[PDB]
């Protein structure tokens, strides 16, 4: 009768090189990742997360161990990445996630000239009737970082949300300086 929910967020960010590789054939540097929504260390209950990429790569099955869980790799096309989350408790069934590697922008986002592509989805790992050890591990998770934790799902809108404040404050300071100090010098 014990149910513990661990919210997570998985996805990938991609950056366009601006030109296709000379002889390789890659166009975007992308980083698939799995990270928690709440500021907590997932490794307290996660043993390893495997990322099975396309067979075209030398090693399709990547692995990570610690709270980040990101592999940086370059590619040329979009494909489905199978993410399998293994827990410390071997009696707990691993969780399998399916994420579509997104590298290209939509026409609307392309017209905006934004360089970074982002696609991560909100998810929750439901542990129904977990073992005593797994329950303790889930309940004893510590905080990961001292700062805040954020997500840029789409980014198209988060960039505008950030700019509306950043550029506003920057322009206000620039004006307060230029309009006032020149007249102060005039006096």
């Amino acid at each position: 009768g014990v149910t513990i929910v661990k919210p997570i967020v998985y996805g990938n960010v991609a950056r366009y090189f601006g030109k296709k590789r000379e002889e390789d054939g890659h166009t975007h540097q992308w980083t698939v990742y799995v990270k928690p929504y709440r500021n907590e260390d997932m490794s307290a209950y996660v043993k390893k997360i495997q990322f099975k990429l396309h067979e075209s790569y030398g090693n399709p099955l990547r692995v990570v161990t610690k709270p980040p869980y990101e592999i940086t790799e370059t590619g040329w096309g979009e494909f489905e990445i199978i993410i399998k989350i293994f827990f410390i408790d071997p009696n707990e069934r691993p969780v399998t996630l399916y994420h579509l590697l997104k590298l290209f922008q939509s026409d609307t986002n392309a017209m905006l000239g934004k360089k970074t592509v982002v696609s991560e989805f909100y998810d929750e790992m439901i542990f129904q009737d977990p073992t005593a050890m797994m329950q303790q591990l889930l309940t004893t998770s510590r905080q990961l970082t001292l700062g805040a934790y954020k997500h840029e799902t789409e980014f198209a809108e988060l960039e505008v949300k950030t700019r509306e404040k950043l550029e506003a404050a920057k322009k206000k300071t620039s004006f307060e300086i230029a309009e006032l100090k020149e007249r102060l010098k005039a006096s």
């Binding site: 620039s174 300086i177 230029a178 100090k181 020149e182 102060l184 010098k185």
Partner: peptide, 15 residues
């Protein structure tokens, strides 16, 4: 103050 005023005016022009 003055050189930074010049620099910031040039920046605002470029901006």
């Amino acid at each position: 103050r003055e050189k930074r005023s010049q620099d910031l005016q040039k920046l605002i022009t470029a901006a």
